[PDB]
């Protein structure tokens, strides 16, 4: 991996720095690195694989070194370098593609393609140099089992799930008490609905609790917590849990009462925020417990009093919302996020060459299925293919 990254890094640096007119002192170290790459790769044969529709490609390296005598680079020097760079870039792109479309259940962190296995030999370790990208840095750190961290803007941590729980129900579905939620991506919209508006509840308070278990621990997470859930504030016709029938939902939004968001790690409470909504920090947690109460307003104007009768029929159902958006966090495991393209790149390469479904990942690299069942083997394979995708995106 470090060798493949070093090849790609050398090629990117050569593309950016070997330019017409530049001082040779600007590229001296780069030229020495590039010539070392040429010498190491010369005389070697590689085969990038025929898995799926990815075509079998053979690579042979017999290149001359780049010159070292110029004071400034000229057009001829740049074009001569560009020919070799283009061949090397094509080879690295094909190696990355071959690796990305492969998985194993035993050593998913180990190389899976023939070319990357060959590059793991000692003779290619001379190519290795500056490993400064986030993914390669994390790769080297976790190879030594040092504490790693991936920074994610809007981490796609929550598997998609639009569900509801009914604590009070009956076949008519006209006096219902419960919660409905969407946990999608980096957002949780939850809403507790009481159809009676806690008319007969003790103290006229209806307590709602929503627990979300993250499949991986998040640290240094910045989160927005808005009082209302705009997703569950309009009339809906909702299937029943068994799908037998539908029920009507006609929310009227009351501000949630005694809002308490707890962030927990291994069942211990790490962070707790009460009646706070701007922007909160969860420093280290794997579970989010949201408590919110529907408090019947003791005083009502005639319209409000009309909306909430003493007994059935209940036609305007008191709903208290909550919206939690993890804007940024840090995870020791690779995750899909809103900014990075690693997941999209891996999925695109697997779809373009019609890669048969493997024993590790769900078909189509579906992220909901993956993050729902984020096992250590899946984590290893995913980190491998994501690091390879970043290496590829350095060039393509």
């Amino acid at each position: 991996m470090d060798v493949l990254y070093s090849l790609s890094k050398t090629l990117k640096d050569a593309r950016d720095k070997i330019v017409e007119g530049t001082l040779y002192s600007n590229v001296s170290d780069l030229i020495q690195q590039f010539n070392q790459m040429i010498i190491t790769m010369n005389g070697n044969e590689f085969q990038t694989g025929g898995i799926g529709n990815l075509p079998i490609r053979n690579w042979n390296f017999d290149f001359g070194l780049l010159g070292t005598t110029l004071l400034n680079l000229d057009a001829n020097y740049v074009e001569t370098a560009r020919n070799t760079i283009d061949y090397f870039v094509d080879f690295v792109d094909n190696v990355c593609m071959d690796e990305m479309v492969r998985e194993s259940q035993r050593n998913g962190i180990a190389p899976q393609s023939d070319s990357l296995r060959k590059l793991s030999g000692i003779k290619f370790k001379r190519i290795n140099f500056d490993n400064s990208s986030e993914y390669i840095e994390n790769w080297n750190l976790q190879n030594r089992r040092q504490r790693t961290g991936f920074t994610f803007h809007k981490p796609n941590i929550f598997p998609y799930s639009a569900s509801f729980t009914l604590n009070r129900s009956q076949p008519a579905h006209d006096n219902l008490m419960g919660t409905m939620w969407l946990n999608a991506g980096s957002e949780i919209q939850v809403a507790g609905f009481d159809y009676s508006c806690a008319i007969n509840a003790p103290a006229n308070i209806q307590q709602f609790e929503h627990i979300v278990q993250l499949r991986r621990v998040l640290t240094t997470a910045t989160i927005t917590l808005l009082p209302d859930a705009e997703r569950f504030s309009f009339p809906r016709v909702i299937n029943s849990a068994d799908g037998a029938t539908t029920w009507y939902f006609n929310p009227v939004i009351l501000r949630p009462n005694n809002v308490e968001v707890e962030f927990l790690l291994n069942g211990q409470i790490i962070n707790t925020y009460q009646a706070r909504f701007g922007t909160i920090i969860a420093r280290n947690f794997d579970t989010i417990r949201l408590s919110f109460q529907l408090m019947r307003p003791p005083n009502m104007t005639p319209a409000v009093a009309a909306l909430f009768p003493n007994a059935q029929p209940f036609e305007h159902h008191a709903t208290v919302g909550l919206t939690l958006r993890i804007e940024s966090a840090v995870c020791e495991s690779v995750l899909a996020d809103a900014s990075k393209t690693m997941l999209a790149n891996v999925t695109s390469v697997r779809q373009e060459y019609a890669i048969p479904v493997g024993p590790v990942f769900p078909p189509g690299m579906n992220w909901t299925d993956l993050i729902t069942n984020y096992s250590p083997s899946r984590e290893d394979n995913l980190q491998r293919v994501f690091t390879v995708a970043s290496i590829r995106s350095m060039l393509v």
């Binding site: 569900s163 008519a172 299937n239 029943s240 068994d242 799908g243 009768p309 059935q312 029929p313």
Partner: protein
């Protein structure tokens, strides 16, 4: 159930809809149509029940599933009403004079009640909360009330002298008395011809539908003056002939049943739950 009634039920908002359960419901359900005597008198056919059963069969119901029960009038029907089938549709003729009795009958049959016996001759009774009512049924229910105070002496009435009692009901078949809550009352009722029960309105009864034949919307199944809930089970039609009324009931039986929820039928046929 009972060891899991207080347990949550979770459903996903993408579970595919099952097919229609209307045909199966009709195949496994029983229908009871309640009509007044004047209906059968005006139809003047001895095979009209068979005609209705066959038409329902065209509408999906099996042969021996739709039953017909006749009552003399609203006041008589209100004496121990007995709802028999899974689905009970009551064709109630409208009268501008029987408005309160229509409302009381509709209240008794469109809501579930938990009732306990009262001993007016021994104890003084009060209505605890806004759902606590008194329901009196009998051939002739006359109910008179004497409100009391914390010292048990009556106000505007004398316990010894019943004649001073503030009468609330006279010559009634069904009456729903609603007195001020928290005040002990002494009651005089015709115990010979009237039974009074301390009842609580638990909730709606969803397997009973009331089609008001003629008239306007006058039903008031709620004691609270500020609310007159018109529900899916309180229909109203305009009529000239009873045959057209029954044709309308048969044709839109899909809509009528769809407006009612099964599983509300009790093991007993009474309109109230009696607990000692």
């Amino acid at each position: 159930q009972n060891y899991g009634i207080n347990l949550p039920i979770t459903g996903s908002m993408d579970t595919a809809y099952a097919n229609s359960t209307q045909e199966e419901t009709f195949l496994t359900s029983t229908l009871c149509l309640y009509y007044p005597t004047e209906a059968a008198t005006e139809i003047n056919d001895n095979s009209w029940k068979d005609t209705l059963s066959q038409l329902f069969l065209t509408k999906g119901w099996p042969t021996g599933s739709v039953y017909f029960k006749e009552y003399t009038d609203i006041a008589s029907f209100s004496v121990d009403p007995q709802l028999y089938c899974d689905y009970n549709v009551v064709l109630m003729k409208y009268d501008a004079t029987l408005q309160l009795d229509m409302s009381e009958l509709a209240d008794l049959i469109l809501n579930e009640w938990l009732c306990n016996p009262m001993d007016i001759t021994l104890y003084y009774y009060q209505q605890t909360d806004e759902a606590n009512k008194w329901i009196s049924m009998g051939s002739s229910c006359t109910i008179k009330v004497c409100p009391l105070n914390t010292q048990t002496l009556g106000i505007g009435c004398l316990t010894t002298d019943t004649a001073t009692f503030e009468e609330v009901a006279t010559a009634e078949k069904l009456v729903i008395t609603d007195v001020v809550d928290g005040v002990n009352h002494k009651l005089d009722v015709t115990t010979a011809t009237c039974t009074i029960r301390n009842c609580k309105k638990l909730g709606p009864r969803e397997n009973v539908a009331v089609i008001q034949v003629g008239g306007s919307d006058v039903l008031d199944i709620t004691a609270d003056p500020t609310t007159a809930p018109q529900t899916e089970r309180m229909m109203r039609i305009n009529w000239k002939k009873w045959w057209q009324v029954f044709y309308t009931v048969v044709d839109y039986v899909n809509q009528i049943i769809q407006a009612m929820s099964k599983r509300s039928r009790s093991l007993n046929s009474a309109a109230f739950y009696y607990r000692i």
